[PDB]
Design a protein around this ligand. Structure first.
Ligand SMILES: NC(=O)C1=CN([C@@H]2O[C@H](COP(=O)(O)OP(=O)(O)OC[C@H]3O[C@@H](n4cnc5c(N)ncnc54)[C@H](OP(=O)(O)O)[C@@H]3O)[C@@H](O)[C@H]2O)C=CC1
Ligand SMILES: NC(=O)C1=CN([C@@H]2O[C@H](COP(=O)(O)OP(=O)(O)OC[C@H]3O[C@@H](n4cnc5c(N)ncnc54)[C@H](OP(=O)(O)O)[C@@H]3O)[C@@H](O)[C@H]2O)C=CC1
Lengths: 364, 364
């Protein structure tokens, strides 16, 4: 018998108000033939996990009395890395010690353990296996725990919609310091796409600029430069002088920022909106649509991959391979370790409240 | 010799400030083998004509001294109907008496006559020719003079981007009382497409609503209803009962109106922005792109048909056919006849100033 903790809520609302920790037992001596028990190694706090709890995200786990609560309650978190503890008698896809991530969204990853079917998980090579397979590197906890959402988002947005000619074409993105932005920059470098990252100004601008260029951004500008009429021609020269064109814009901010990157694209440009950190709508001048044949669309990784395991697998394997080859690094996280001295849900409420400091990862 | 008049400007500005009339001569006796002389029957004042003169429209006539001015001057007007008066010794495509429209934009239609090559024009059937073919109707001056821009814009937006299932699917459009909106309603009913027209409220609402439904709108709502969450379910019920889906939105207003019509589309919807009469940008909530997979694109008939004679020809023929059969009616115009007593340019300046009254057509 295993005693586990799960972060739940009986009703939607702000994480700071509705989350709680529910103690529950998992019978490791009576697993159905296809069941598996996993122990969480780490799971992050992503904006979508929060919106899901708030009730403003159209994809969520059902509320049930399954964890032993009197009222129906839903679990939290959609991605994370777990270590397999035990498999049922008919399980062959997984075994003790394996590293896995949920095979689908809405599994609930903010907890110490989980009981599920073998098909509820996807196996990632763990360090022991990467070494035995002769790979140069093995995944870290954070890399495994954040491999499902942000890296695939960056990869698919950059390759699934418009073909950028290697060594010539460009994509421009705001939210340059975001985890997704950092993954996009690297993938751009790996695929040989040029790129402009737009970020908010800061006292350590120079340091962040060099850091993002190391990751792979060709040029880094501030939102003030993004808004500047006078600076505009300098950006256009970068594109024109490269021989390619700015064909794609990645927007996760909205507002003025989204207007600014759209204006930087060449005619027939495409913008993918995948986030709205400013809480401002996407505003595009009528002229961009008519005279520059601009197109504005959306991206939702959860929806793109829910019934396309093939595209998901192919994308995931590429990220894993780059991690094993030492060609990709992770958007780093501020890790908070659960040790039982502080209720689990509080560690997540803190991670939520401290999101502004950067990606939060609760570890176990 | 023929003494002609042309409305010109030597510098971009407001029509009321920079326009003037230039008298020039055409030698109807010295025609090159492939030249043609035509006299204008009528030409409209369209928003794009004005934007062109203002210098905020990226497609324009080269300034030249061809009309006998010392400083380079540009002509005005992009569409219109002309009657062929004389053709060169090598012209077989046109005969005296034929009706033609410019074959390309930027020809300058705000003038009494024009000398050009045969390939500078596209023949339309004149009344006698339509009649000799047993067609119920011949084209009127206004129908011929306004056939190049608004009707083709409406047709191509409804048929060239997303396929609406006849008898089922819907398109929604703002700017319902505009000439384009009136063509879209008619083309919509002729192709058996369902549609909702959005217009600004007015005291004679009932009459305008009835009028738009006769033209082809299935339903007509005000912008207030467009802004209404309360009203939302009513629209959704209309679509549900039809068994179809709202797949396309036509936007020529911008601002809140563009937001409102975008929201009423079913998931995977497409909006075509082709105008922005409110002078407000297209604003779309982040959630529509991500969760509803909405797409916002542009439309510019000038750019689309620029190097696509076949698509232009085909679309033009379908409009001519509907006029000849009597199935399509023109967005009516307020006509001002030039008789040589008031400078030609003033007639057009009045046309520009009285735009809000409705489509203006200067006749000859
Ligand atoms: N649609 C999809 O499939 C996916 C969408 N997303 C979206 O991406 C965003 C989260 O990304 P990750 O999860 O990569 O994010 P992180 O939490 O790592 O980064 C968030 C970023 O947003 C920036 N930011 C915060 N507030 C503002 C503001 N007011 N104006 C401009 N920028 C601001 C931060 O700036 P700074 O560095 O200056 O502090 C930081 O760069 C969310 O919008 C999330 O919902 C993520 C994955 C997938
Ligand atoms: N290829 C392209 O991209 C093309 C673009 N256009 C664009 O379409 C529009 C012109 O259309 P046509 O040439 O059909 O126009 P008209 O001038 O004939 O009609 C314009 C109509 O728009 C309405 N209108 C004016 N201001 C507003 C507002 N703020 N909100 C809602 N309605 C408003 C009027 O309403 P009411 O009568 O009720 O007062 C009027 O019925 C312009 O935006 C023009 O540039 C046209 C052809 C092609």
């Amino acid at each position: 018998m295993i005693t586990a903790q799960a972060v739940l809520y009986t009703q939607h609302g702000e994480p700071k108000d509705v989350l709680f920790t529910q103690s529950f037992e998992i019978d490791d001596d009576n697993l159905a033939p296809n069941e598996v028990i996993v122990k969480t190694l780490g799971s992050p706090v992503n904006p979508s996990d929060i919106n899901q709890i708030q009730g403003v995200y159209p994809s969520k786990p059902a509320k049930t009395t399954g964890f032993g609560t009197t009222e129906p309650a839903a679990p939290c978190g959609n991605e994370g890395l777990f270590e397999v503890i035990k498999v049922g008698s008919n399980v062959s896809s997984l075994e003790a010690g394996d590293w896995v991530i949920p095979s689908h969204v809405n599994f609930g990853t903010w907890r110490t353990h989980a009981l599920g079917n073998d098909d509820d998980f996807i196996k990632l090579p763990n360090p022991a296996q990467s070494k035995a397979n002769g790979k140069p590197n093995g995944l870290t906890i954070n890399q495994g725990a954040t491999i499902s959402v942000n890296p695939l988002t960056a990869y698919l947005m950059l390759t699934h919609y418009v073909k950028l000619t290697p060594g010539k074409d460009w994509f421009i993105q705001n939210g340059g310091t975001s985890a997704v932005g950092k993954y996009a920059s690297q993938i751009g470098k790996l695929l040989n796409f040029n790129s402009i990252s737009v970020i908010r100004d800061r006292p350590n601008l120079d340091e962040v600029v060099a850091s993002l260029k190391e990751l792979g951004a060709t040029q880094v500008i501030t939102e003030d430069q993004n808004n500047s009429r006078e600076f505009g021609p300098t950006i256009k020269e970068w594109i024109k002088q490269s021989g390619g064109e700015a064909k794609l814009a990645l927007n996760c901010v909205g507002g003025k920022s989204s207007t600014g990157i759209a204006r930087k694209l060449n005619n027939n440009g495409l913008m993918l909106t995948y986030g709205g950190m400013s809480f401002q709508p996407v505003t595009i001048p009528t002229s961009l649509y008519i005279f520059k044949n601009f197109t504005s669309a959306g991206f939702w990784v959860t929806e793109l991959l829910k019934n396309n395991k093939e595209l998901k697998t192919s994308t995931l394997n590429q990220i894993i391979a780059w991690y094993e080859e030492g060609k990709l690094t992770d958007a780093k996280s501020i890790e908070t370790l659960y040790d039982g001295t502080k209720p689990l849900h509080e560690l997540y409420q803190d991670g939520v409240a401290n999101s502004k400091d950067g990606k939060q990862l609760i570890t176990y």
